[PDB]
Symmetry: D3
Subunit: 157 residues, 6 copies
Amino acid sequence: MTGAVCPGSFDPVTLGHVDIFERAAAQFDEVVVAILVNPAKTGMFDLDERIAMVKESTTHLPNLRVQVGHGLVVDFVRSCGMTAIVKGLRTGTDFEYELQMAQMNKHIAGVDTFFVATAPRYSFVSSSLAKEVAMLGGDVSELLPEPVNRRLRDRLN
Amino acid sequence: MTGAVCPGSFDPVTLGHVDIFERAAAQFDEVVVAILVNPAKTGMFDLDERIAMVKESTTHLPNLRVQVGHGLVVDFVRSCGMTAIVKGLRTGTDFEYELQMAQMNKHIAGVDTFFVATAPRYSFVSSSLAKEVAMLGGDVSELLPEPVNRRLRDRLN
Amino acid sequence: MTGAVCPGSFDPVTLGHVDIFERAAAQFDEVVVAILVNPAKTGMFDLDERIAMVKESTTHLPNLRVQVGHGLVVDFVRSCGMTAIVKGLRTGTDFEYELQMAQMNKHIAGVDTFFVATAPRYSFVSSSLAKEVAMLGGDVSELLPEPVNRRLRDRLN
Amino acid sequence: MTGAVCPGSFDPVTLGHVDIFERAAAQFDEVVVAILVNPAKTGMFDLDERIAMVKESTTHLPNLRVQVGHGLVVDFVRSCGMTAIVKGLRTGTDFEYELQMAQMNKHIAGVDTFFVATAPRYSFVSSSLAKEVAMLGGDVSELLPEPVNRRLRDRLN
Amino acid sequence: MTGAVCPGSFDPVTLGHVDIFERAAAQFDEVVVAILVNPAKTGMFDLDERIAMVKESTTHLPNLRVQVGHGLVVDFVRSCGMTAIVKGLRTGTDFEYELQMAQMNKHIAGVDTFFVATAPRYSFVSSSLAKEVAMLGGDVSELLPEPVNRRLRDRLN
Amino acid sequence: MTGAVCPGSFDPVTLGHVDIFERAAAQFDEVVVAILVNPAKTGMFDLDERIAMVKESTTHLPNLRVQVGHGLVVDFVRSCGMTAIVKGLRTGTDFEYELQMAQMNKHIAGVDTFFVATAPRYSFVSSSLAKEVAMLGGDVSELLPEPVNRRLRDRLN
């Protein structure tokens, strides 16, 4: 009867994201991770790689599924038969923008957005900073799932 | 299988609170509104009045129940067989403090806290400001449930 | 004797902007809406369209006029014989940047900037989010003036 | 035709407040400084002292007048035949609370609140911190008007 | 040649505070922990207990010393022959107030204040929340030094 | 024994930056200003110009040296034999992002980041806003060192 969508680019998924997936799966009957397409072309990992990384990092969550999102998040959400979005907060989150989008999403489709603080140990990782640090030779392996580290190292070597 | 607690002093409940109750009830199988006791004595409405006002303002929510909370919120939550708290954000929310408590609550009891932005029209009411304005003769009746306005007017007259 | 400038790109004007125009016109003898040019070319509506949309959306404000701005806002302001800017705050406003600019504008030209919170119902619309949602097929017609909706729909059809 | 109210406890007035008075007087035909009563008794300077300090610190502002406020600020404002409040922002301002009050004041009485950033040199003084520092023997004389320093020193000696 | 003061009430000291002590001691030749007196009487631990808890929790920091502070922090700082204060940031810090005080402290005594983010694992503990949780029976032992837990448990038993 | 790095693009250095250099030099035995390379090519001043401007603006700081940074800031810091970064806060600073980077920098290299509020008079200048205003003909000469104004005027004339 209950369901939530966890939308994002996940380029790549981090342990911060996985923390949020785990909490959504614990509180909702079904969770759908919506991987948004990168239309303007310029990400690090292509869509298939991002799906695989999320799937491989979430095998311990039987009530969670992974799907590609297209168009408005609220359209995807309602297409899943749901009316809730679950999003993580971490250090560096643009929360004012997240609030603006949440209020807009409520306005246009009646979809609620629930925010949850990510675990402190994963509160400073973001996809973008993780990539930037790793590209410059820094070790972020404790902040990403092993399926992601495997792929990141390959791009390095 | 799913449940959330909505804790607060509700002295008195506002339409901002009710907005949040409605969204929790739409997303969780069961919702429990936990009315905290005022230990240091100094609220406007006594416990029984606060319970009644919440009950009367939530008759349209069949999966919601009202109970008095004692001790740590996380103790009450876990006593309800749940592991989630749902709290509203509005203008004037001390969000840094709410985040601190959420991280502490997660640490001590494993309880997740989900934050949701209250509807814009109810985003500037708070129990405290509602009381202060009404005591000084201002009309806040559009921001409180009719069961609360009834009681507020009585204290005025 | 009193006057304020309301500067912006207005691509397109929203009811959030109009709310702010109305409050400036109520508090100042004259208001000038300064539509900034888009130098690096990349907006949705060209300058003439933006002027028309603002004019058509403000016919109820007899003491308000619309002009194209060029160069520093403070140069435009002082060219209007004024020393005040009126700007709206809404959800998602980069207020730190607005404050930085206000302090800089005061420093270089002695111009004061007055900030006013937009009405809650219009607090989550922005030109950019309105366009993005509409382009993806979402209904934002309640958050934009009818002169803008008319033009937006035409670009859709 | 235009007017603004500048409300506060002014216990005592600071150069931060005077900065804001000056900007209101430059932009509005008339300005009224509303000194709020201290009902629960516990300020440093009594009402008459606060009025005198504001008057003496504003002799260079011919279109500004000083009055004691009673009850809701919006009641005082409308009693002045005005519909605008002008308030300063400085370091340490509880802006979320100021926003909440502004939205509430708009809701109950249709009164607009304009916020303006205080001059950087006066951005870290507040009545409360000024008193606390001076009581402990610190020199805050550059951040307060001479009429206030005169009175502060007397309480010291 | 270099020195910093770490001021606070430390009622009681937390691992968040100790984290900050460690970083100051690593970056400055000498560190002085200034324990402020509680003038209005109402803390949990008396001055001697607070000193002991800090001393016992910092035996691994040979260049750190503990002293009682009286009066303005900047007076204490300059009495130590120093011109720097080091303060931690954590979740729930009133940073605007900390900034206001820092700018005031710079103004009155030329003392600089350096802010450092506490370690994520200790970012949600504060003296006040630690006491409140423990008094209600919650386990905060991982967030406080063992010398503090020893004393906290005694007050419980 | 003590040292700090002050990293930035300094395109160009402002008096806000110099304020921070001065405070670092007063509190640490050695300070290194790390000028980051602009890899994606698009700054106003080339690397040699930026170095010269910083050097010329810091002749009064004998314990400060200027060097070009390459790669991760923490790699540069540790290459200097240091473990501290000193960064300024001003109006418009993206402090959430600065905090995220600080926590990440601590995680990957054990390097501490100390934040200090810039002097109020220099709190609203940034390299980017200074350039934008000057390019549009505004006078920012009081907010930049004379070595920078000299070069800025040359580009104008």
